[PDB]
Amino acid sequence: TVGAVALDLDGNLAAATSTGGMTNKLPGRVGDSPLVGAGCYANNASVAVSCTGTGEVFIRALAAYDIAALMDYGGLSLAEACERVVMEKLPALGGSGGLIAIDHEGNVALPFNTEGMYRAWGYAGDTPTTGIYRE
C-alpha cells in the first residue's frame, strides 16, 4: 500500500491511497484502502489521512475518519489523535500498521506501530525527510 496527503497553497487538503492488498488474500477481498474513512479521508476543516497495515482492523476501527473525529469532537491535536489511534486503539484490536496525516494548520504526523514504514515528507520550498525505521 502507498499513499499521499497534502496541504496546498490555497489551504486545501487531499488524500490518496493505492494498493494490491494483502499477500495471499482471497480473490474478491477488499481492504481499507479504497474505503472512505477507513484507509483514506480528507476534509479541509480537519485532516487528510492515508493508512497502511492490517486492513480488516482499519475498516472495523474506521481509522482515517477516527483521526478526524478525535480532533473534531474529542478535542485532540493531530499528534494526540494519531497516538491514540495507531499506538493504542489499533493494536488493542489486533491491527498493526500506520498512517500519514496532515491537518488544516499544516501539522504533519507519520505514526506507525510496526518495525518500519516507508515514508517521506516535506514543506514546499524545503528539503524533504525520508525514513524506513522507527525514531
Partner: protein, 160 residues
C-alpha cells in the same frame, strides 16, 4: 499553514537486520524523488488533489511498492487492485476496488470522482467505466514481480 506533502510506501515487518544499505537506499531514493516532485508541484501552485494523485501514481509505477506495478498476489496468483482519492475542499471522493486491467488505480479513482455521479466502483464495472474515459486495458501480468511472488510463496510456506 505552510504547504506540505507526506507520502508512504507501506508499513510492516521491514527488518533492519535482514536489509543491506544498498537495498535501503533504493527505497530512500524512490521516496525522496517522489516527495520532491510533490513539493515542487506544491510550490508551483498545483492543487493538493493533483499532488496526491501524482505522488500515488509514481508510487504505483515504482515496482518497489505494493500498488500498481509491484502489487502483491492473491491466493490464486493474480492481482486485484484498490485505490481511493478524496478532495477536502468539496468532500468529493472516488474509489475503485478489485480492478485487474487498469494500470493506475489512483487515476481510475480520480475518474470516478470527477466524471461520475458515484464515489465507488468495483470490478469489471469500474474497468469498463475507466476504459470509456481513456484508460487502456492492460494485462494483470504487468504488475507481477519476482519480489512479491517470492513473498507469496514464503507466506504459503509459513501457512504449511
Amino acid at each position: 499553514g505552510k504547504a506540505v506533502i507526506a507520502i508512504h510506501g507501506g508499513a510492516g515487518a521491514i527488518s533492519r537486520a535482514q536489509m543491506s544499505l544498498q537495498q535501503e537506499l533504493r527505497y530512500i531514493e524512490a521516496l525522496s524523488a517522489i516527495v520532491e516532485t510533490g513539493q515542487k508541484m506544491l510550490e508551483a501552485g498545483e492543487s493538493a488533489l493533483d499532488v496526491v494523485t501524482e505522488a500515488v501514481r509514481l508510487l504505483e509505477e515504482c515496482p518497489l511498492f505494493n500498488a500498481g506495478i509491484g502489487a502483491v498476489f492473491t491466493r490464486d496468483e493474480t492481482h486485484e487492485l484498490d485505490a481511493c482519492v478524496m478532495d477536502g475542499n468539496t468532500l468529493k471522493a472516488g474509489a475503485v476496488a478489485g480492478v485487474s486491467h487498469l494500470r493506475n488505480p489512483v487515476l481510475a479513482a480520480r475518474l470516478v470522482m470527477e466524471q461520475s455521479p458515484h464515489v465507488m466502483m468495483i470490478g469489471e464495472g469500474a474497468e469498463n467505466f475507466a476504459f470509456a474515459r481513456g484508460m487502456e486495458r492492460v494485462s494483470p501480468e504487468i504488475f507481477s514481480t519476482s519480489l512479491r511472488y517470492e513473498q507469496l510463496l514464503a507466506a504459503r510456506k509459513e501457512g504449511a
